[PDB]
Design a protein around this ligand. Sequence first.
Ligand code: 2EH
Ligand code: CL
Length: 152
Amino acid sequence: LNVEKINGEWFSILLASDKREKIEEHGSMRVFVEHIHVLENSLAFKFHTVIDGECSEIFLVADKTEKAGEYSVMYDGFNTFTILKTDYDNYIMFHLINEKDGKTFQLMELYGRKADLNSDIKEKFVKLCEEHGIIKENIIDLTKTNRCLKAR
Ligand SMILES: CCCC[C@H](CC)CO
Ligand SMILES: [Cl-]
C-alpha cells in the first residue's frame, strides 16, 4: 500500500457489520465518506450522516498505531482499522474493529471514487465480508439509501 494515493474524494458504497444495528438507519456507524486526507501520522476523514432526517457533518482523524498499516480513532468507543484492498483510483475496502464496554464488532466498508461501483467489485466485497464472518444479510448497499449526496 502506497497510502498517499488514497487521498481525496470518496463515496460510501457498501457498509457491513457483524452487529447490524450499528449500520442501520439510526446506527452510529451509518456515515457517508466525503474525503480522506493523508497526513504524515494520520488519516483525516470527513463524513456526512443523517440525524433525525437531516444531514450533518462528522470529522475524524485516525492516528497510526504501533502496528504497521493500522490506524486508531475514538468514535463510539475505540476503533482500529486497516485497508484490505484498493486500486487507488476506483475502490478501497476498509476493515475496522470497534471496542466498547468489553465487547467488539467488525465493520467493513467499500468506498468508490464515484457514487457507484460495478457489480463485480461489489460481489468481491461481499465475499470478503463473508470471509470475516459478516453474512450477506448484514451488508447494506448505501446507493439505495440516503447518503446525503446533496450535502457534499
Ligand atoms: C475507515 C472506516 C471509518 C468508519 C466509520 C467511522 C469510524 C464508521 O462507519
Ligand atoms: Cl443521497
